[PDB]
Amino acid sequence: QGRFRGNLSGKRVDFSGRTVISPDPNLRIDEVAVPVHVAKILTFPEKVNKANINFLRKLVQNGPEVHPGANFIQQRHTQMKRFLKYGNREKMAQELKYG
């Protein structure tokens, strides 16, 4: 449990989960099933660009409650995060700038 073996070579990370496995032959070999509960918790930071702008708008409008959505928004100018559970998600989506 030392600093070399316990905190440098192997250390704990976030954005990870641990769950029991079950068989499902209806999925491809390169595909894995993720439950909705763990999917709503594990988030991915996507950068707003000219391609997925409308998809991110729809995700923000959906919000943290509906499965397809997001949980937080970090503005480009200021690094103050914004929780989507509160505030007007429609306004937050309409005010999505690139970056």
Binding site: F15, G17, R18, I21, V34
Partner: protein, 50 residues
């Protein structure tokens, strides 16, 4: 694994470069064989061979 109560870990990368490297190098379709002797590990199993 044997599906007898084993717990497995699932990690989500937080970077596009890490995502691409995981998909390319650690691809399931690209790692169908082991580097030990080249034998394929991802193949048919019980209830499929029979």
């Amino acid at each position: 694994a044997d599906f007898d109560g084993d717990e497995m870990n699932l990690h989500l990368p937080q970077t596009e470069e890490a995502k691409a490297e995981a998909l390319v190098l650690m691809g399931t379709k690209a790692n169908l064989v082991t580097p030990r002797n080249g034998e394929p590990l991802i193949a048919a199993i019980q209830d499929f061979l029979t």
